[PDB]
Amino acid sequence: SDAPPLTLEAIKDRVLYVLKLYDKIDPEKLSVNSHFMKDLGLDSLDQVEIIMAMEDEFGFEIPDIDAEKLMCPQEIVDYIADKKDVYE
Amino acid sequence: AFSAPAAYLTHQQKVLRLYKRALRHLESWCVHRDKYRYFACLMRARFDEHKNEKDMVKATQLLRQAEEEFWYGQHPQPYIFPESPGGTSYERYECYKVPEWCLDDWHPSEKAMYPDYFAKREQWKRLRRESWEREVKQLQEETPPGGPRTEALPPARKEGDLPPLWWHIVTRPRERPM
Amino acid sequence: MLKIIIPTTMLLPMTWMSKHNMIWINATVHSLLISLISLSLLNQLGENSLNFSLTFFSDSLSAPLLVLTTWLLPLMLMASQSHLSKETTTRKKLYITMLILLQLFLIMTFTATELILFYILFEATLVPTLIIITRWGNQTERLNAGLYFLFYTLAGSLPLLVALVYIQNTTGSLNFLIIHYWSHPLSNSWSNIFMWLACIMAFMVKMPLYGLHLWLPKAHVEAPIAGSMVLAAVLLKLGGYGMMRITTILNPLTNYMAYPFLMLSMWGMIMTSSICLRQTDLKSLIAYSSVSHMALVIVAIMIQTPWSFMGATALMIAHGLTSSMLFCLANTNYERVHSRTMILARGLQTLLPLMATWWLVASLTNLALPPSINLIGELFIITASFSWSNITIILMGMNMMITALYSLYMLITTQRGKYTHHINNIKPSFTRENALMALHILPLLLLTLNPKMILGPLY
Amino acid sequence: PTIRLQEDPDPEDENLYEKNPDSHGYDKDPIVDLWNMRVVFFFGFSIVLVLGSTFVAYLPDYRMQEWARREAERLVKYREANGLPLMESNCFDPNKIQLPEDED
Amino acid sequence: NVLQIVRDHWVHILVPVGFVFGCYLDRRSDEKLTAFRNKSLLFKRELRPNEEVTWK
Amino acid sequence: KRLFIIKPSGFYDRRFLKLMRFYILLTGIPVAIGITLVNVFIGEAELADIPEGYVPEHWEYFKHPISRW
Ligand SMILES: CCCCCCCCCCCCCCCCCC(=O)OC[C@H](COP(=O)([O-])OCC(O)COP(=O)([O-])OC[C@@H](COC(=O)CCCCCCCCCCCCCCCCC)OC(=O)CCCCCCCCCCCCCCCCC)OC(=O)CCCCCCCCCCCCCCCCC
Ligand SMILES: CCCCCCCCCCCCCCCCC[C@@H](O)O[C@H](CO[C@H](O)CCCCCCCCCCCCCCC)COP(=O)(O)OCC[N+](C)(C)C
Ligand SMILES: CCCCCCCCCCCCCCCCC[C@@H](O)O[C@H](CO[C@H](O)CCCCCCCCCCCCCCC)COP(=O)(O)OCC[N+](C)(C)C
Ligand SMILES: CCCCCCCC/C=C\CCCCCCCC(=O)O[C@H](COC(=O)CCCCCCC/C=C/CCCCCCCC)COP(=O)(O)OCCN
Ligand SMILES: CCCCCCCCCCCC(=O)SCCNC(=O)CCNC(=O)[C@H](O)C(C)(C)COP(=O)(O)O
């Protein structure tokens, strides 16, 4: 058959993995609720690059109107879970 | 897709969208990962060259010139994600999506199978019928007299209230319904 | 021939003496029995026709049309009873009476030996159709449609009456056998030219010919389902049958009197096929497709070759069955959503798979897929036209391409894509509708095994 | 009244499946509906289609095609057994035709 | 037991009786066109020792 | 893990198909068996010359027994 169904824990772990592979973010400092603009001191271009990295990670495109408001890892996890119908 | 659009795009939003489009088309041109990374850092540097401009007129002219450059140098066959509006699997599973109201027309012999599912569906229908009037009342309360100004909807604010106009958002068939 | 006519008349007191809840059952059962009885007329002698008496005769051209009418009546009854459920008993009986009277006039029209009786019955068919359209039509445009349908027909038919009485005065008879055996050439004169026109224009407008076809979209769209069924399946074929009967005495004038009609028919079949590509109403598309098919039939009749008449007969039968099926298919969706707009209800294959199969088969027969009888008739007509002139193939191929285009366009628009979200009253298909589609489609496919039954006398 | 006339409101169409989950779409009365379906199916699919198609398929050869083939076989055998042409360009005998005597 | 069902279903004989009457009238109409019976040059025949007509 | 599949009702189309097949077979299986029995046991006629002084019936000019009947 095809790939096993995706889970919330896997989504969050993969999001944190991608963010910890980013150089402008301290691995120790980073948290699921860590704000990008406020806590990590990032700008809009870094957020765009993070969104593109998430799209490359999960193999699907996020529209620009929705990606504008993903300012913490938890929001990205919620968006991915709701789009792919992941409930547990 | 999920967010209500605004009346217009700011200069900042247009700038970020142009940045993302240029990066994606450069990745389409630069197939390999290392070369793409090199030219993407070069693009980021050229993009940050005018990061702190204060004259809006010259910033707008720079944006127009950048858009012209992108259009002339875009990839005629850019990479598209399969489920994206241009992908090879964009609307592949639309024929498998059946609306939930079709389950009411099922024969009683069909509903003899799957009894618990239909009991829970009855529970959901009672919930919707008992919440609809409160949803309408809340929408009437929280709306300016000259009609709504945007496509945004308010959340629930009371103890046992549900967000107005939720049935057709919660009861989406699926992304892979079969 | 009385063994067919008398039971059809008996259908009237039988339905007027039935209980309020048994009229549909009784009428359907006895209409099917009458169709079974009428099926026995297909045994044809070859050399000459079956001359039952002085008043009636049967031909290899008349028999398939008679069988088609007798078979169409029960399908009309099955299609009607859904939208007439709220009607009173007396009005339902009156509707069934209209249908029975139309059947009786049609069966008598196709068997008359003499042209004045044929004219009388061929005009008598007008009244029941007009009453049906103007009384049980749904919209307010049914009155204008009925006026168009009546006056377009009569303006052509009255000169035919004058020409027929003049011809009987000059020759001494109008009996078709005497007409055929004592045929003499028509000279090249203005009097003969106008006699030709008076003998031709009524059947031209009944086909209808392009340029005289404006009544057909109105009447076929604004009529109830049974009215549209009988208009498309049978009443259009009266013109073709009349042309085949009447052109026997028109030679050798037809050699050049047919040029404007051939030009009009070819270019207008192109025009109507193109029109079908941009249509917002589902019934109008079917009506215009009927116009194109009848234009091809007009060309076949005008060119006066045995292959042309064979193809014309086959195309008449096939078009009648296919158009009736398509009208019923459109009516099912209209009953679901109470609107004729094509893009209102989309993606119906997701909700109704078997009806989608019926739609696919009807669309395939409309585009004349081999080896269906539709393509048999169309190919015979195209070959006859090619013999007439090699340049006709350009227009024939263009018409084939456009026909496939709008047929598949209708199928894709109505059945494919995603369903309309807000429409939530699409119930599963009833047994009656599926049975009606099956009873339309199965004779079409069964006629492929025995094509000679519908090829006509020239076979 | 700001109204033009006293009219009944347009009623909603009633689903036959609501009172009869297996209703065949023929009638409101379940018994009449069932018997309508039965008579339609029996007198259409059982009587007309199958039996009528069999009757048409086994129609006697009144069109004289087998007879024509046998006659053609006899004529061809007789004609090439004697060296005669298989067919004449003249359908009728020239000896019973009396053309006009002078053509100029 | 049959009285009421006859009274409510007698309508089912009208069409078969019409069919029989039509066949009978067709035979009567055939009976009026016997002017050339056994008189055509193609089908003229010598009667069998017991038959009276070639067709009826 | 198993999930519910939302589908339109297939009971009615399946019932219509069963009814149509049932009636068609009910009427056409006896016809097929009868045709087979007639063909096997009462074959087609064979061509023969018309005997002297004999006139055949109209149905005796056809060879299939069903067509003759
Ligand atoms: C279904 C529901 C869903 C929707 C349905 C939609 C459809 C609705 C249909 C509506 C109703 C339609 C009605 C139509 C009526 C048609 C009647 C008709 O006209 O019949 C004509 C015809 C009857 O001919 P006839 O004029 O009576 O012939 C008289 C002859 O003079 C003399 O003949 P004979 O002396 O040779 O006698 C032969 C005899 C006896 O023959 C034999 O027994 C010998 C056979 C060989 C056996 C050798 C092996 C066995 C013995 C040895 C082994 C045991 C001992 C050794 C042990 C050794 C151990 C090691 O049996 C037969 O006669 C043949 C069978 C006839 C059956 C006819 C059935 C027609 C039914 C009509 C209604 C159908 C309604 C539908 C339901 C039908 C029922 C399911 O029947 C056929 O045409 C049969 C066709 C055979 C075809 C052969 C293969 C041809 C293939 C060519 C194409 C190649 C490409 C692939 C194509 C594939 C296509 C499939
Ligand atoms: C929208 C669709 C409506 C239906 C369409 C119906 C089509 C009707 C057209 C009829 C076809 C032709 C009619 C007669 C054939 C030839 C006509 C004429 O033009 O030919 C010449 C005729 O010469 C002159 O042209 C005379 C006719 C001129 C007067 C007619 C007016 C035409 C103007 C167009 C008006 C539109 C008519 C349709 C109204 C709707 C031939 O020269 P000649 O060999 O010497 O005469 C042959 C006749 N003889 C033997 C008796 C001597
Ligand atoms: C839904 C599930 C589908 C899957 C199941 C499919 C099962 C198999 C389907 C495929 C069957 C293929 C059958 C192929 C034909 C075999 C039988 C065929 O050979 O018989 C034909 C017989 O066909 C019929 O003759 C013609 C059909 C007649 C149709 C009349 C329909 C009844 C009237 C209904 C109303 C019509 C209204 C419109 C009329 C104008 C041809 O006869 P012919 O080869 O010569 O006979 C030679 C021997 N004879 C002459 C002695 C008999
Ligand atoms: C709804 C649209 C349909 C329109 C169809 C209308 C066209 C009908 C055809 C013409 C109608 C009149 C035909 C007259 C009946 C024919 C009888 C006949 O042949 O008699 C002629 C008489 O011929 C005429 O009188 C015809 C003159 C025309 C009278 C009315 C003219 C009206 C317009 C005519 C042209 C339009 C017809 C075609 C148009 C089709 C529709 C656009 C010769 O008789 P005699 O006097 O004995 O001559 C030999 C001995 N000397
Ligand atoms: C592969 C082919 C593609 C090639 C096409 C060409 C690509 C374009 C080349 C050059 C583009 C430019 O210089 S474009 C000129 C850029 N200059 C400005 O935008 C001035 C004002 N800056 C702001 O408003 C914000 O700081 C903002 C920058 C939006 C960040 O916002 P955040 O920090 O709040 O995220």
mmCIF file of N, CA and C in Angstrom, chain C residues 325-409:
data_model
loop_
_atom_site.group_PDB
_atom_site.id
_atom_site.type_symbol
_atom_site.label_atom_id
_atom_site.label_comp_id
_atom_site.label_asym_id
_atom_site.label_seq_id
_atom_site.Cartn_x
_atom_site.Cartn_y
_atom_site.Cartn_z
ATOM 1 N N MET C 325 -34.923 9.700 -26.175
ATOM 2 C CA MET C 325 -34.126 9.346 -25.003
ATOM 3 C C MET C 325 -33.450 10.571 -24.397
ATOM 4 N N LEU C 326 -32.897 11.445 -25.241
ATOM 5 C CA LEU C 326 -32.213 12.636 -24.742
ATOM 6 C C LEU C 326 -33.181 13.582 -24.042
ATOM 7 N N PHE C 327 -34.383 13.752 -24.599
ATOM 8 C CA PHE C 327 -35.374 14.602 -23.949
ATOM 9 C C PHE C 327 -35.772 14.042 -22.589
ATOM 10 N N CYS C 328 -35.954 12.723 -22.494
ATOM 11 C CA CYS C 328 -36.279 12.128 -21.199
ATOM 12 C C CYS C 328 -35.144 12.321 -20.196
ATOM 13 N N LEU C 329 -33.898 12.175 -20.655
ATOM 14 C CA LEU C 329 -32.751 12.370 -19.773
ATOM 15 C C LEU C 329 -32.701 13.799 -19.246
ATOM 16 N N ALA C 330 -32.955 14.778 -20.117
ATOM 17 C CA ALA C 330 -32.998 16.167 -19.666
ATOM 18 C C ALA C 330 -34.145 16.396 -18.689
ATOM 19 N N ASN C 331 -35.299 15.777 -18.954
ATOM 20 C CA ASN C 331 -36.465 15.965 -18.098
ATOM 21 C C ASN C 331 -36.237 15.426 -16.694
ATOM 22 N N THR C 332 -35.492 14.328 -16.555
ATOM 23 C CA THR C 332 -35.210 13.814 -15.213
ATOM 24 C C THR C 332 -34.486 14.860 -14.365
ATOM 25 N N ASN C 333 -33.429 15.458 -14.918
ATOM 26 C CA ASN C 333 -32.690 16.479 -14.185
ATOM 27 C C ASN C 333 -33.547 17.713 -13.941
ATOM 28 N N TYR C 334 -34.380 18.088 -14.919
ATOM 29 C CA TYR C 334 -35.267 19.229 -14.712
ATOM 30 C C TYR C 334 -36.230 18.972 -13.560
ATOM 31 N N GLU C 335 -36.775 17.759 -13.478
ATOM 32 C CA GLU C 335 -37.636 17.411 -12.355
ATOM 33 C C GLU C 335 -36.871 17.451 -11.042
ATOM 34 N N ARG C 336 -35.583 17.105 -11.068
ATOM 35 C CA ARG C 336 -34.782 17.208 -9.850
ATOM 36 C C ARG C 336 -34.612 18.658 -9.404
ATOM 37 N N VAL C 337 -34.188 19.543 -10.307
ATOM 38 C CA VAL C 337 -33.723 20.872 -9.911
ATOM 39 C C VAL C 337 -34.626 21.996 -10.395
ATOM 40 N N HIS C 338 -35.682 21.696 -11.153
ATOM 41 C CA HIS C 338 -36.663 22.698 -11.585
ATOM 42 C C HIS C 338 -36.012 23.854 -12.346
ATOM 43 N N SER C 339 -35.030 23.536 -13.185
ATOM 44 C CA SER C 339 -34.421 24.540 -14.047
ATOM 45 C C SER C 339 -33.767 23.842 -15.229
ATOM 46 N N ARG C 340 -33.835 24.492 -16.390
ATOM 47 C CA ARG C 340 -33.302 23.931 -17.623
ATOM 48 C C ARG C 340 -31.871 24.363 -17.916
ATOM 49 N N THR C 341 -31.285 25.230 -17.095
ATOM 50 C CA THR C 341 -29.930 25.697 -17.349
ATOM 51 C C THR C 341 -28.934 24.558 -17.173
ATOM 52 N N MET C 342 -28.043 24.410 -18.154
ATOM 53 C CA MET C 342 -27.141 23.266 -18.190
ATOM 54 C C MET C 342 -26.114 23.291 -17.064
ATOM 55 N N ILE C 343 -25.578 24.470 -16.726
ATOM 56 C CA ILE C 343 -24.507 24.559 -15.737
ATOM 57 C C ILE C 343 -25.020 24.664 -14.309
ATOM 58 N N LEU C 344 -26.338 24.652 -14.099
ATOM 59 C CA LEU C 344 -26.857 24.716 -12.737
ATOM 60 C C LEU C 344 -26.480 23.468 -11.947
ATOM 61 N N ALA C 345 -26.737 22.292 -12.511
ATOM 62 C CA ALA C 345 -26.405 21.022 -11.880
ATOM 63 C C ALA C 345 -25.244 20.392 -12.634
ATOM 64 N N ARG C 346 -24.146 20.145 -11.926
ATOM 65 C CA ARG C 346 -22.928 19.616 -12.519
ATOM 66 C C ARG C 346 -22.483 18.386 -11.742
ATOM 67 N N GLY C 347 -21.605 17.606 -12.365
ATOM 68 C CA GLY C 347 -21.042 16.433 -11.711
ATOM 69 C C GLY C 347 -22.072 15.427 -11.250
ATOM 70 N N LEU C 348 -23.094 15.173 -12.070
ATOM 71 C CA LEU C 348 -24.160 14.264 -11.674
ATOM 72 C C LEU C 348 -23.725 12.806 -11.704
ATOM 73 N N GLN C 349 -22.580 12.502 -12.319
ATOM 74 C CA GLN C 349 -22.079 11.132 -12.314
ATOM 75 C C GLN C 349 -21.723 10.676 -10.905
ATOM 76 N N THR C 350 -21.253 11.596 -10.061
ATOM 77 C CA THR C 350 -20.940 11.250 -8.680
ATOM 78 C C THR C 350 -22.189 10.850 -7.906
ATOM 79 N N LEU C 351 -23.332 11.461 -8.217
ATOM 80 C CA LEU C 351 -24.568 11.203 -7.494
ATOM 81 C C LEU C 351 -25.462 10.166 -8.162
ATOM 82 N N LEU C 352 -25.473 10.100 -9.494
ATOM 83 C CA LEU C 352 -26.333 9.179 -10.238
ATOM 84 C C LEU C 352 -25.498 8.435 -11.272
ATOM 85 N N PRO C 353 -24.929 7.282 -10.906
ATOM 86 C CA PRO C 353 -24.056 6.573 -11.859
ATOM 87 C C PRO C 353 -24.800 5.909 -13.007
ATOM 88 N N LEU C 354 -25.923 5.238 -12.735
ATOM 89 C CA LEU C 354 -26.648 4.556 -13.805
ATOM 90 C C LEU C 354 -27.253 5.553 -14.786
ATOM 91 N N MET C 355 -27.780 6.667 -14.277
ATOM 92 C CA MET C 355 -28.251 7.719 -15.167
ATOM 93 C C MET C 355 -27.103 8.304 -15.977
ATOM 94 N N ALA C 356 -25.897 8.342 -15.403
ATOM 95 C CA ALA C 356 -24.728 8.771 -16.164
ATOM 96 C C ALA C 356 -24.406 7.784 -17.281
ATOM 97 N N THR C 357 -24.579 6.487 -17.023
ATOM 98 C CA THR C 357 -24.402 5.495 -18.080
ATOM 99 C C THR C 357 -25.418 5.693 -19.197
ATOM 100 N N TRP C 358 -26.678 5.947 -18.832
ATOM 101 C CA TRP C 358 -27.693 6.237 -19.843
ATOM 102 C C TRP C 358 -27.324 7.480 -20.647
ATOM 103 N N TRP C 359 -26.827 8.514 -19.965
ATOM 104 C CA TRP C 359 -26.387 9.730 -20.641
ATOM 105 C C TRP C 359 -25.270 9.431 -21.631
ATOM 106 N N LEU C 360 -24.295 8.620 -21.213
ATOM 107 C CA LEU C 360 -23.177 8.283 -22.088
ATOM 108 C C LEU C 360 -23.649 7.525 -23.320
ATOM 109 N N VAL C 361 -24.549 6.556 -23.138
ATOM 110 C CA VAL C 361 -25.024 5.783 -24.282
ATOM 111 C C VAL C 361 -25.827 6.665 -25.233
ATOM 112 N N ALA C 362 -26.675 7.543 -24.689
ATOM 113 C CA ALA C 362 -27.445 8.443 -25.540
ATOM 114 C C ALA C 362 -26.536 9.397 -26.307
ATOM 115 N N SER C 363 -25.502 9.925 -25.647
ATOM 116 C CA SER C 363 -24.560 10.805 -26.330
ATOM 117 C C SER C 363 -23.775 10.062 -27.402
ATOM 118 N N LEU C 364 -23.421 8.801 -27.150
ATOM 119 C CA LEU C 364 -22.713 8.010 -28.149
ATOM 120 C C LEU C 364 -23.590 7.726 -29.360
ATOM 121 N N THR C 365 -24.878 7.450 -29.138
ATOM 122 C CA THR C 365 -25.779 7.242 -30.268
ATOM 123 C C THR C 365 -26.074 8.544 -31.000
ATOM 124 N N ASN C 366 -26.024 9.680 -30.299
ATOM 125 C CA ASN C 366 -26.273 10.960 -30.955
ATOM 126 C C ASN C 366 -25.156 11.310 -31.931
ATOM 127 N N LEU C 367 -23.914 10.969 -31.596
ATOM 128 C CA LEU C 367 -22.779 11.218 -32.474
ATOM 129 C C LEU C 367 -22.575 10.108 -33.496
ATOM 130 N N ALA C 368 -23.487 9.134 -33.551
ATOM 131 C CA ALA C 368 -23.485 8.067 -34.552
ATOM 132 C C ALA C 368 -22.200 7.235 -34.476
ATOM 133 N N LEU C 369 -22.060 6.546 -33.353
ATOM 134 C CA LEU C 369 -20.969 5.591 -33.184
ATOM 135 C C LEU C 369 -21.283 4.297 -33.932
ATOM 136 N N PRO C 370 -20.310 3.703 -34.630
ATOM 137 C CA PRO C 370 -20.568 2.427 -35.295
ATOM 138 C C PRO C 370 -20.696 1.306 -34.282
ATOM 139 N N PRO C 371 -21.449 0.243 -34.604
ATOM 140 C CA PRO C 371 -22.221 0.118 -35.841
ATOM 141 C C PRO C 371 -23.694 0.459 -35.653
ATOM 142 N N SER C 372 -23.978 1.516 -34.896
ATOM 143 C CA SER C 372 -25.358 1.901 -34.648
ATOM 144 C C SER C 372 -26.031 2.349 -35.942
ATOM 145 N N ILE C 373 -27.364 2.271 -35.947
ATOM 146 C CA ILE C 373 -28.132 2.615 -37.134
ATOM 147 C C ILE C 373 -28.037 4.098 -37.466
ATOM 148 N N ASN C 374 -27.736 4.944 -36.477
ATOM 149 C CA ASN C 374 -27.517 6.361 -36.751
ATOM 150 C C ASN C 374 -26.399 6.550 -37.766
ATOM 151 N N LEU C 375 -25.255 5.901 -37.533
ATOM 152 C CA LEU C 375 -24.169 5.988 -38.499
ATOM 153 C C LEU C 375 -24.495 5.242 -39.781
ATOM 154 N N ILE C 376 -25.304 4.184 -39.725
ATOM 155 C CA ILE C 376 -25.695 3.515 -40.963
ATOM 156 C C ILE C 376 -26.403 4.500 -41.886
ATOM 157 N N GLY C 377 -27.415 5.190 -41.356
ATOM 158 C CA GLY C 377 -28.128 6.169 -42.160
ATOM 159 C C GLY C 377 -27.242 7.321 -42.590
ATOM 160 N N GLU C 378 -26.443 7.849 -41.657
ATOM 161 C CA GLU C 378 -25.596 8.992 -41.976
ATOM 162 C C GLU C 378 -24.560 8.641 -43.039
ATOM 163 N N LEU C 379 -23.940 7.465 -42.929
ATOM 164 C CA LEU C 379 -22.945 7.034 -43.901
ATOM 165 C C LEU C 379 -23.571 6.789 -45.265
ATOM 166 N N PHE C 380 -24.767 6.193 -45.304
ATOM 167 C CA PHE C 380 -25.428 6.001 -46.591
ATOM 168 C C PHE C 380 -25.739 7.342 -47.248
ATOM 169 N N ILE C 381 -26.231 8.304 -46.461
ATOM 170 C CA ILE C 381 -26.525 9.631 -46.998
ATOM 171 C C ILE C 381 -25.249 10.314 -47.476
ATOM 172 N N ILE C 382 -24.161 10.177 -46.716
ATOM 173 C CA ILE C 382 -22.905 10.822 -47.084
ATOM 174 C C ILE C 382 -22.351 10.224 -48.370
ATOM 175 N N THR C 383 -22.439 8.901 -48.522
ATOM 176 C CA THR C 383 -21.991 8.266 -49.757
ATOM 177 C C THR C 383 -22.836 8.713 -50.944
ATOM 178 N N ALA C 384 -24.156 8.789 -50.757
ATOM 179 C CA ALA C 384 -25.020 9.256 -51.837
ATOM 180 C C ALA C 384 -24.691 10.693 -52.222
ATOM 181 N N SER C 385 -24.426 11.547 -51.231
ATOM 182 C CA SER C 385 -24.032 12.925 -51.513
ATOM 183 C C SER C 385 -22.698 12.981 -52.246
ATOM 184 N N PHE C 386 -21.747 12.134 -51.848
ATOM 185 C CA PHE C 386 -20.460 12.075 -52.533
ATOM 186 C C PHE C 386 -20.638 11.683 -53.992
ATOM 187 N N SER C 387 -21.532 10.731 -54.260
ATOM 188 C CA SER C 387 -21.864 10.406 -55.644
ATOM 189 C C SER C 387 -22.494 11.603 -56.347
ATOM 190 N N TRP C 388 -23.355 12.339 -55.639
ATOM 191 C CA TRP C 388 -23.948 13.551 -56.197
ATOM 192 C C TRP C 388 -22.884 14.600 -56.500
ATOM 193 N N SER C 389 -21.938 14.793 -55.581
ATOM 194 C CA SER C 389 -20.827 15.716 -55.787
ATOM 195 C C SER C 389 -19.760 15.425 -54.742
ATOM 196 N N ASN C 390 -18.503 15.340 -55.180
ATOM 197 C CA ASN C 390 -17.404 15.009 -54.280
ATOM 198 C C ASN C 390 -17.104 16.109 -53.270
ATOM 199 N N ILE C 391 -17.593 17.332 -53.490
ATOM 200 C CA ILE C 391 -17.292 18.441 -52.586
ATOM 201 C C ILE C 391 -18.161 18.438 -51.338
ATOM 202 N N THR C 392 -19.222 17.628 -51.307
ATOM 203 C CA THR C 392 -20.086 17.558 -50.132
ATOM 204 C C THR C 392 -19.376 16.976 -48.915
ATOM 205 N N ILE C 393 -18.280 16.242 -49.126
ATOM 206 C CA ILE C 393 -17.596 15.570 -48.026
ATOM 207 C C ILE C 393 -17.030 16.578 -47.036
ATOM 208 N N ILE C 394 -16.656 17.771 -47.506
ATOM 209 C CA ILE C 394 -16.140 18.798 -46.602
ATOM 210 C C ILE C 394 -17.194 19.167 -45.567
ATOM 211 N N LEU C 395 -18.409 19.469 -46.033
ATOM 212 C CA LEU C 395 -19.486 19.841 -45.124
ATOM 213 C C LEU C 395 -19.911 18.664 -44.256
ATOM 214 N N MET C 396 -19.946 17.455 -44.825
ATOM 215 C CA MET C 396 -20.318 16.287 -44.028
ATOM 216 C C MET C 396 -19.324 16.048 -42.895
ATOM 217 N N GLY C 397 -18.025 16.144 -43.186
ATOM 218 C CA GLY C 397 -17.025 15.953 -42.150
ATOM 219 C C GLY C 397 -17.046 17.050 -41.105
ATOM 220 N N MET C 398 -17.244 18.299 -41.540
ATOM 221 C CA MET C 398 -17.373 19.390 -40.581
ATOM 222 C C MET C 398 -18.556 19.159 -39.650
ATOM 223 N N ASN C 399 -19.691 18.728 -40.205
ATOM 224 C CA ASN C 399 -20.865 18.459 -39.383
ATOM 225 C C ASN C 399 -20.606 17.316 -38.412
ATOM 226 N N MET C 400 -19.915 16.266 -38.863
ATOM 227 C CA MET C 400 -19.580 15.166 -37.962
ATOM 228 C C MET C 400 -18.725 15.648 -36.796
ATOM 229 N N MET C 401 -17.697 16.450 -37.092
ATOM 230 C CA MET C 401 -16.821 16.950 -36.039
ATOM 231 C C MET C 401 -17.596 17.798 -35.039
ATOM 232 N N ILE C 402 -18.412 18.732 -35.532
ATOM 233 C CA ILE C 402 -19.151 19.598 -34.617
ATOM 234 C C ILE C 402 -20.182 18.802 -33.822
ATOM 235 N N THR C 403 -20.783 17.773 -34.428
ATOM 236 C CA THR C 403 -21.752 16.955 -33.707
ATOM 237 C C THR C 403 -21.092 16.226 -32.548
ATOM 238 N N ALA C 404 -19.945 15.592 -32.803
ATOM 239 C CA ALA C 404 -19.206 14.970 -31.710
ATOM 240 C C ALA C 404 -18.847 16.002 -30.650
ATOM 241 N N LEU C 405 -18.444 17.201 -31.086
ATOM 242 C CA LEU C 405 -18.045 18.241 -30.145
ATOM 243 C C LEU C 405 -19.179 18.612 -29.197
ATOM 244 N N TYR C 406 -20.363 18.952 -29.725
ATOM 245 C CA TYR C 406 -21.380 19.397 -28.772
ATOM 246 C C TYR C 406 -21.992 18.232 -28.004
ATOM 247 N N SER C 407 -22.039 17.029 -28.587
ATOM 248 C CA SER C 407 -22.530 15.883 -27.827
ATOM 249 C C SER C 407 -21.666 15.640 -26.596
ATOM 250 N N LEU C 408 -20.347 15.566 -26.790
ATOM 251 C CA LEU C 408 -19.480 15.347 -25.643
ATOM 252 C C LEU C 408 -19.426 16.570 -24.739
ATOM 253 N N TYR C 409 -19.642 17.769 -25.286
ATOM 254 C CA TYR C 409 -19.723 18.960 -24.448
ATOM 255 C C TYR C 409 -20.897 18.870 -23.485
#
